[PDB]
Curated annotation (Swiss-Prot), chains A, C, D:
Residues with site note (Interacts with activating enzyme): R54, R72
Effect of K48R: No effect on HLTF-mediated polyubiquitination of PCNA
Effect of S65G: Phosphomimetic mutant that can recruit PRKN to mitochondria
Species, as recorded: Homo sapiens
Encoding gene per record: UBA52
Cross-link (Glycyl lysine isopeptide (Gly-Lys) (interchain with K-? in acceptor proteins)): G76
Record-listed ADP-ribosylglycine modification sites: G76
Effect listed in the UniProt record for changing R74G: No effect on ADP-ribosylation
Shown chain mapped onto the complete sequence: 1 to 76 of 128
Protein's name according to its UniProt entry: Ubiquitin
Modified residues (Phosphoserine): S65
Placement of covalent cross-link Glycyl lysine isopeptide (Lys-Gly) (interchain with G-Cter in ubiquitin): K6, K11, K27, K29, K33, K48, R63
Role summary: Exists either covalently attached to another protein, or free (unanchored). When covalently bound, it is conjugated to target proteins via an isopeptide bond either as a monomer (monoubiquitin), a polymer linked via different Lys residues of the ubiquitin (polyubiquitin chains) or a linear polymer linked via the initiator Met of the ubiquitin (linear polyubiquitin chains).
Protein localization: Cytoplasm; Nucleus
Domain Ubiquitin-like: start-end pairs: 1-76
Modified residues ((Microbial infection) ADP-ribosylthreonine): T66
Length: 76, 75, 76, 76
């Protein structure tokens, strides 16, 4: 299924995922499509920060759902 | 001065701040107004999570600027 | 009816409602007021969570009653 | 160390625990001291529901800290 990942600055990317995928996995896909290290990533759904161990099913994330990406890097 | 803190769900609140206010000071004011504990908060500007010991001016956040608030039940 | 929905952290949210208003409706008004997604909230009264579907009248909730709000983390 | 668990109805209960005790471990202690099944307990600290797999030290709950307990309403 397709889902959208957006930053608060406007960048939007699409990703083929499964309801069984973990947030960690999603982060890895974001790394392949955008080169952003998972460590500097923070996925958000419904204003809540997401934890890596859970799956998209757990958060009730359906197809074409939009996930928000925020970067986290020391100093900037 | 005043700045706005918005959630990704529609809510928006205004805060009276000073360029010299740190991010943690802003979290404390959000707590005073919304009751959200500062450790559960994560403030965002220019697409990135801000750091506690930094001031608003360090990030060039000015009057009427907009910060976004996301929650993190750190656990 | 003006009731009060209070978080355990000191925040009070007043709301106009009616005896026939069901639980999900109260959550809807809560969203409009504070933006918190309805599925994200757990309403409390008489020390216990209020189930989806019953109205305020089914719990004898009346004018100026106080309901506590807490967020369920698993999906909110 | 001691910590206090309080219900919204005013029931206060003292528990003996260790910082490394999991929320689930704490619920077992509540059941043995009060008879409430863990599946029906919802523990809270600073307005947020605690995860069963995490420990008290994870939420930095220390000696004499106070938690909240709301019951799982199956039918009322």
């Amino acid at each position: 299924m397709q889902i959208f990942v957006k930053t608060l600055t406007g960048k939007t990317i699409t990703l083929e995922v499964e309801p069984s995928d973990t947030i960690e996995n999603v982060k890895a896909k974001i790394q392949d499509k955008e080169g952003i290290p998972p460590d500097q990533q923070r996925l958000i759904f419904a204003g809540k920060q997401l934890e890596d161990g859970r799956t998209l099913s757990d958060y009730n994330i359906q197809r074409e759902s939009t996930l928000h990406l925020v970067l986290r890097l020391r100093g900037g």
